Every structure is written in structure tokens, then in C-alpha cells.
Design an enzyme around this catalytic site. Structure first.
Site, PDB file in Angstrom:
ATOM      1  N   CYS A  75      -1.936  89.135  16.398  1.00 34.48           N
ATOM      2  CA  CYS A  75      -1.674  88.023  17.363  1.00 34.48           C
ATOM      3  C   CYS A  75      -2.864  87.092  17.592  1.00 34.48           C
ATOM      4  O   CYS A  75      -2.719  85.903  17.958  1.00 34.48           O
ATOM      5  CB  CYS A  75      -1.208  88.567  18.721  1.00 34.48           C
ATOM      6  SG  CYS A  75      -2.401  89.608  19.664  1.00 34.48           S
ATOM      7  N   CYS A 157      -2.009  85.308  20.639  1.00 29.08           N
ATOM      8  CA  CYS A 157      -2.800  85.780  21.763  1.00 29.08           C
ATOM      9  C   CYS A 157      -4.269  85.342  21.511  1.00 29.08           C
ATOM     10  O   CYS A 157      -4.597  84.876  20.406  1.00 29.08           O
ATOM     11  CB  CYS A 157      -2.636  87.295  21.915  1.00 29.08           C
ATOM     12  SG  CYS A 157      -3.576  88.224  20.657  1.00 29.08           S
TER      13      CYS A 157
END
Ligand code: NMN
Length: 252
Positions: A75, A157
């Protein structure tokens, strides 16, 4: 015909075989995608647009394909891009660490291809497909990329990177898929920073394009989402890739 139904180019020749071959090759190379049955993937892909009016496609149409193409991507290693695709891909081919959407099974299957079907029949339309602007936006190709580009942004992320084309005019374009879809679907709970790499075209001594109005606009949109914004110029993308391939030493 000397006219054609739609204004867009038709389905890529040998679409079925091309997608199936792509799925085989990807699932052979990438070990996490070994569970995947490529025939089932083709069937789901086909189910999304076959026998459907190619201006009445929904994200819902692609949910069977999305499920089958479910894939974990690191991520914190996501690279988005807008308009400019080739450097992004050349970079990730060395930097086999960052990942673009087209490095995933679903992005890989569809990259550079066009497809659509017909309401009255189960035939693939190899003659023309809707143009997003001239015909309809709810067409099979545009819908697919909207759905997958959304989900890819939602997976990100930490620090998310985006390459933008500094030779354009609107370096950041609110109307692109990056601008209209991805920017608004980064999750502020998880994403700390979006960092833009503004890729210069030609140029002797060039301007700091991180001061461009559309860059400031992007900064404003992102910062108002409670996500930090950072920007870097890549003044010579060709020296850039050379440094990615051979870090240290030289003018790196
Ligand atoms: N490979 C493609 O054809 C394609 C098409 C639309 C969106 N996307 C995703 O959206 C972004 C590019 O779309 P835009 O150039 O419309 O900004 C990239 O992050 C890309 O992963 C990819």
C-alpha cells in the site's frame, strides 16, 4: 459501412484471445495470482459488457471481474500518474518496487485495449465503440478504468506518488482520472502525503513547475482533505531513469 455507429475506435482485434493470453502470462509470472482461473476471468470480463447497451455500463457490471481480480498491492509503494504513462512504466520496470495500476492483474489485462458489445446481440463490436466525449461516458472502457482506478487509490497508504506531465498545459487536470477519481479516493486515515513528480518535456534551464497554478490547486485540494502535499521537478526524465538504473556515481 462508411459511417459506423459510434465515434470511437472499435474493439481491439482478437480481444478475447489477447485478454486470455495476458491473464495466463501474468498469473504465470506473479506467484500470488496462481489461484486465478483465467477462463473464469475472461467470462467475468465478458459478462460485464456483452449483451449490454454500451452507453449503459455500470461499476456494478464489473463487480464479478473485480472479485476474481482481487489482489494485495504493497500500500505504501503505489505510483499514480496522469496523461503520461510511459515513464511511469519504465520506472517501475527497474524500480520493481513501486507499482502502477497496470502492474496489477486487472490493469495489465486491459492496458491499451478497447472493447464494447451490443444491446441486441452477444457480439463484440469490432467496428466502433462509444467515445467518452462525443457519445457517452458510461461506456465499457471508461467505466472499467473509473472503477479500477478508484479501487487502486483506495488501497494506498503512507506516501503515495504521482507522476504528472509538466509539458502539458494543465499539469494537474481536475478532469483527468487522476484528478477526478483518484485524488478524491485516497483515504486520509491512511495516506500521509501525496508527492507529485512533475516531469519536464524539452527544456534548457527550466522553471520550477511546482509553482504552477494547477499544482497549487492540487496542493489546496489535497491539503483540504487532511493529506500533506509535496512536489519535485524531474527536469530531465532520461537522466532520472539512468540514476534509477545506476544510482550513485555520475551526476546523480
Ligand atoms: N492504463 C490506462 O489506460 C488508464 C486509464 C485511465 C486511468 N488510469 C489510471 O488513472 C491515472 C491516469 O488517468 P488520467 O491520465 O486520466 O489521469 C493513473 O493513475 C492510471 O493508473 C489508467
Amino acid at each position: 459501412r462508411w459511417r459506423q455507429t459510434w465515434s470511437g475506435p472499435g474493439t481491439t482485434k482478437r480481444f478475447p484471445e489477447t485478454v486470455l493470453a495476458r491473464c495466463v502470462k501474468y498469473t504465470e509470472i506473479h506467484p500470488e495470482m496462481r489461484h486465478v482461473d483465467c477462463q473464469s476471468v475472461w467470462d467475468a470480463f465478458k459478462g460485464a459488457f456483452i449483451s449490454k447497451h454500451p452507453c449503459d455500463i455500470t461499476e456494478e457490471d464489473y463487480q464479478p471481474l473485480m472479485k476474481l481480480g482481487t489482489q494485495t498491492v504493497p500500500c505504501n509503494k503505489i505510483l499514480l500518474w496522469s496523461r503520461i504513462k510511459d515513464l511511469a512504466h519504465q520506472f517501475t520496470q527497474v524500480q520493481r518496487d513501486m507499482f502502477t495500476l497496470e502492474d496489477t492483474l486487472l490493469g495489465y489485462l486491459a492496458d491499451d485495449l478497447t472493447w464494447c458489445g451490443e444491446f441486441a446481440t452477444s457480439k463484440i463490436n469490432y467496428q466502433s465503440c462509444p467515445d467518452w466525449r462525443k457519445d457517452c461516458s458510461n461506456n465499457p472502457v471508461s467505466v472499467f478504468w473509473k472503477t479500477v482506478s478508484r479501487r487502486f487509490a483506495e488501497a494506498a497508504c503512507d506516501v503515495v506518488h504521482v507522476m504528472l506531465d509538466g509539458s502539458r498545459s494543465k499539469i494537474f487536470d481536475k478532469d483527468s482520472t487522476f484528478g477526478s477519481v483518484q485524488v478524491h479516493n485516497l483515504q486520509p486515515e491512511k495516506v500521509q502525503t501525496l508527492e507529485a513528480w512533475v516531469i519536464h518535456g524539452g527544456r534548457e534551464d527550466s522553471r520550477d513547475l511546482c509553482q504552477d497554478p494547477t499544482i497549487k490547486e492540487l496542493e489546496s485540494i489535497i491539503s483540504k482533505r487532511n493529506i500533506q502535499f509535496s512536489c519535485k521537478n524531474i527536469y530531465r526524465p532520461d537522466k532520472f531513469l539512468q540514476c534509477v538504473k545506476n544510482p550513485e556515481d555520475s551526476s546523480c
